[PDB]
């Protein structure tokens, strides 16, 4: 987050540690909690990781210092400070060092050795290889880094060629090819490396993102596909994530999609973006969920669990979102209740009946507020996403089971609930049902109530009125229209949808105390306007000549200069 705030918190922690003057186990616990809070509230940058590692080393905790460093290195490929601290800690280690440190060194070489800031990592790997007696492992590690592009690529190649005493020319042609490829890659990279060393730095800004350096790196990775892409992608992604950038994440994920790499790696990258990226972006997460939906076919077992976990997290962080609920219902009805046309209709109908039963039980229990943790649907359900579940129940009952009486019963029962009364999908499906049946009485009642009892968004009201006008004009006749006309309410299904087009509170069923008269010319400002009680401007002079005209009777004359304003904005927002 804020660098100044982090520095102030670190200074306060140091002051508290100094003022403790003792071992201060409570202060050590407070410092550990503060470090964890900083890591969880920030990107867990190299500076905080190094500060935490230094604090742990001062508290004589090598394992604790390595654990935050190991986490920050596995959570950031460009974590140079974390990698250096881990190497320093693992320099003096136990017998398991030969198995532990080599794996981390190999991971670091496969992840960020092709970066210009990988010189210390290569030096540490060379030192470990020289100290160890594993000649084959050392030669393999040297060969792995000899084919990678770095700033000191020539120096690294010369060092490898001079240290290779027992394997100087084991494969002379491969060695020459590797040396030439590394030299050419370094020469081509030098321009972008310098343009990044002059522009690439984490400062959380446009100059921090280094648009020119990023464009150069993207061009060198896309156009110059020298088969080193498998490592150049990670090398460019390190600097790209050194900047969060939604557009960069989309570019990178599309690039691996064009590579058509194995599914677990792209799933892991999607998860890493889901964690690192902050909330309220709503684009990469939906892209990931759609990717799971399309690639589900490949596995059919693991992707179901991943989808369920992701949907649970997304609906917990976005209480009001709805597309998550329909995606979860589609996934559940596709996976858990698997149907197919080959098998018997009697077996098929049982799955649909079980689906109706589980939806009914979940809805009834949530309405009565008895949540059952065993069923995932009930815990995943939400107060905004109830109308979608009930409308899906209606759709299944009406279309599959073909139980019209039960569908009408469900409509009557759940219409009156405040929780799903003013919802768009429920009333649109009711409209589709009362249109699948031709009956016009229910539809006329519905579009009459559309302004009084059923509060729907005005766009949906316009759509319903237009579509019902067209449907009536196409599927009714004059006899029905004349029978449906009643003049007591002045309701006619042909002109009324045209009149109520954009007025939500349009009703077909002393004019000086009303708000409309009080603020006629200006909206938002209510002023009493002076007027003559017995105004004769309506009468013609021909009938005015009949009798002497009475003197005027006045109204609201003291109120010509006092004007009142209901300053709702200032009252309810600024003063809150």
């Amino acid at each position: 987050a804020l660098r100044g705030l982090d520095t102030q918190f670190l200074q306060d922690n140091t002051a508290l540690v100094q003022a403790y003057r003792g071992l201060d186990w409570s202060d050590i616990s407070s410092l550990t909690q503060m470090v964890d809070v900083i890591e969880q509230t920030v990107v867990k940058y190299g500076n905080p990781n190094d500060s935490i590692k230094l604090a742990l080393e001062t508290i004589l905790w090598q394992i604790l210092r390595k654990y935050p460093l190991l986490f920050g290195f596995w959570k950031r490929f460009a974590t140079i400070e974390y990698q250096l601290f881990g190497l320093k800690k693992s320099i003096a280690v136990l017998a398991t060092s030969v198995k532990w440190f080599p794996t981390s060194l190999e991971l670091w070489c496969d992840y960020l050795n092709v970066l210009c800031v990988n010189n210390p990592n290569e030096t540490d790997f060379i030192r470990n290889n020289f100290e160890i007696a594993k000649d084959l492992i050392g030669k393999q590690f040297l060969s792995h880094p000899f084919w990678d592009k770095f700033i000191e690529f020539e120096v690294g190649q010369k060092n490898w060629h001079n240290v290779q005493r027992i394997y100087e020319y084991i494969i002379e042609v491969p060695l020459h090819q590797y040396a030439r490829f590394f030299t050419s890659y370094k020469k081509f990279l030098n321009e972008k490396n310098l343009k990044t060393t002059r522009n690439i730095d984490i400062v959380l800004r446009k100059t921090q993102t280094t648009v020119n350096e990023i464009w150069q790196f993207e061009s060198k990775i896309k156009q110059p596909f020298f088969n080193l892409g498998q490592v150049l992608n990670d090398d460019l992604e390190n600097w790209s994530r050194y900047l969060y950038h939604e557009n960069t994440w989309m570019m990178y994920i599309k690039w691996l999609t064009k590579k058509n790499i194995s599914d677990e790696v792209v799933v892991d990258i999607y998860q890493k973006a889901n964690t690192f990226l902050p909330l309220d972006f709503k684009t990469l997460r939906y892209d990931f969920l759609r990717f799971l939906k399309r690639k589900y076919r490949s596995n059919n077992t693991l992707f179901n669990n991943i989808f369920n976990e992701t949907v649970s997290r997304y609906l917990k962080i976005w209480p009001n979102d709805i597309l998550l609920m329909t995606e979860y219902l589609c996934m559940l009805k596709r996976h858990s209740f698997k149907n197919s046309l080959d098998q018997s209709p009697k077996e098929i109908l049982e799955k649909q009946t079980s689906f109706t039963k589980i939806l009914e039980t979940s809805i009834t229990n949530y309405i009565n507020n008895q949540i059952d943790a065993k069923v995932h649907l009930q815990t995943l359900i939400n107060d905004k996403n109830l109308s979608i579940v009930v409308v899906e129940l209606i759709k299944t009952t009406w279309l599959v089971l073909k139980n019209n009486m039960q569908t009408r019963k469900y409509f009557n029962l759940y219409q009156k609930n405040i929780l799903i009364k003013n919802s768009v999908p429920f009333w649109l499906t009711y409209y589709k049902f009362e249109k699948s049946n031709v009956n016009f009485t229910k539809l006329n009642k519905f579009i009459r109530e559309l302004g009084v009892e059923i509060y729907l968004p005005t766009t949906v009201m316009n759509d319903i009125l237009t579509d019902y006008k067209t449907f009536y004009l196409t599927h009714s006749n004059i006899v029905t229209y004349e029978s449906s006309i009643i003049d007591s309410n002045t309701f006619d299904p042909i002109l009324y949808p045209e009149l109520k087009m954009s007025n939500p509170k349009y009703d077909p069923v002393d004019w000086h105390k009303k708000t409309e008269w009080k603020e006629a010319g200006h909206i938002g400002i209510t002023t009493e306007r002076p007027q003559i009680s017995n105004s004769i401007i309506e009468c013609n002079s021909g009938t005015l000549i009949q009798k002497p005209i009475s003197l005027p009777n006045f109204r609201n004359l003291e109120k010509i200069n006092q004007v009142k304003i209901n300053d709702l904005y200032t009252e309810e927002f600024l003063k809150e």
Partner: protein, 133 residues
């Protein structure tokens, strides 16, 4: 059932089909199709299918055949029928309609067809994506 022949009378059907015969020059092809779909009864859907959708299928007009909203309209016309049983209509759709379309139109027909599949046929979605590889 006193199902009044709205657009299925020879006086108006002639004009509607004459406008549908232009197929690129006009603007309301999709609106006409979607407003012709809504009939919801055995004989009426039989007539609408045989006269409009089967005839266009046999004529093979590429513009309408590659427009996924046309296939959405056809599947929706069949699926909302109140005469067919659920198994009959699912069988009809999956084994008749989808095989009738060509595979070279996949990249254009897939969006609307998948939109219908996700809304009404979650079980048959696997069959759809398998057949459309």
């Amino acid at each position: 059932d006193s199902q009044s022949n709205g657009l299925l009378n020879k006086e108006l059907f002639d004009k509607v089909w004459k406008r549908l015969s232009c197929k690129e020059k006009k603007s309301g092809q999709e609106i006409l199709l979607n407003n012709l779909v809504q009939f919801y009864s055995k004989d009426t859907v039989e007539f609408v299918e045989k006269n409009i959708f089967q005839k266009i299928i046999e004529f093979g007009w590429e513009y309408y055949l590659q427009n996924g909203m046309f296939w959405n309209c056809y599947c929706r016309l069949i699926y909302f029928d109140t005469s067919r049983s659920y198994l009959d209509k699912r069988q009809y759709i999956v084994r008749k309609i989808w095989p009738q379309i060509d595979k070279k139109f996949a990249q254009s027909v897939l969006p609307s067809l998948t939109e219908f599949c996700e809304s009404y046929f979650p079980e048959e979605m696997d069959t759809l994506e398998e057949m459309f590889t």
